[PDB]
Amino acid sequence: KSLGRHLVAEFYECDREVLDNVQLIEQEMKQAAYESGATIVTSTFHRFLPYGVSGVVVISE
Amino acid sequence: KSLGRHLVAEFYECDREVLDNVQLIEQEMKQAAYESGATIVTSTFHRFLPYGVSGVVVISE
Amino acid sequence: XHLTIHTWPEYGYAAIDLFTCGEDVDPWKAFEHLKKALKAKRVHVVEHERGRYDEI
Amino acid sequence: XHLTIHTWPEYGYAAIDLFTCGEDVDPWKAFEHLKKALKAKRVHVVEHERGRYDEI
Ligand SMILES: C[SH](C)C[C@H]1O[C@@H](n2cnc3c(N)ncnc32)[C@H](O)[C@@H]1O
Ligand SMILES: C[SH](C)C[C@H]1O[C@@H](n2cnc3c(N)ncnc32)[C@H](O)[C@@H]1O
């Protein structure tokens, strides 16, 4: 019915140590992309200061 | 209110040449980031074949 | 965070996401610029509040 | 398309987006893997249809 499906999720009370780990988040995000059956094109992860992580995984059909 | 504001948008009947121009799209996305007042952290744009453009501008502050 | 775009030149359609943080950053300015740049004639926009203060 | 994540460790919060294209890709499988990794104990998810055929 649509070209794509999009989930907008709010995660609360997460493991604060995991949230501030740029390495772990990158691993889990990529593994998450594998689980979905998508093809990873590229990915970029940034570690904010003093805390915070941002990560994007560009995928394709 | 909230930590962030997120616009989920559907653009219809666009100029099809522009949508398939990866260089132009990157230029316009970076400008939009600039116009919103956001700082550009990283940028990555992919040109799909036979047609299509995917792009991401990680921002902050 | 992030500003993203995924286009489908075949259908003249673009999936745009404008996710900004803080009060001094306005995603609607980015929307205004992209609408003009892409020449979109019709749009549908849903605004979400990410990380609502009373939820966290 | 994209899978994105933005964390606020100071609040134990994370804004996640799972935008996939095609029948071969299930965004909920990604959601499940992340829910476990981040050890989230409370979640809210809204599913959007991007590029509805009856619109494009
Ligand atoms: C990952 S992000 C979207 C949010 C996390 O990054 C930290 N941070 C660091 N510098 C900035 C900034 N200039 N703008 C927004 N957030 C900032 C936040 O505190 C949060 O942990
Ligand atoms: C940018 S995308 C999400 C959509 C555009 O890319 C073209 N395309 C080409 N190959 C692929 C693929 N393997 N997965 C997803 N899209 C593909 C689409 O036709 C659309 O223009």
UniProtKB/Swiss-Prot annotation, chains A, B:
Instruction: Locate the transmembrane regions by residue number.
Output: none
- Consequence of changing S54A: Cleaves more rapidly than the wild-type
Please report the name of this protein according to its UniProt entry.
Answer: S-adenosylmethionine decarboxylase beta chain
Q: Whose protein is this, by species? A: Thermotoga maritima (strain ATCC 43589 / DSM 3109 / JCM 10099 / NBRC 100826 / MSB8)
Instruction: Identify the segment of the full-length protein shown.
Output: 2 to 62 of 130
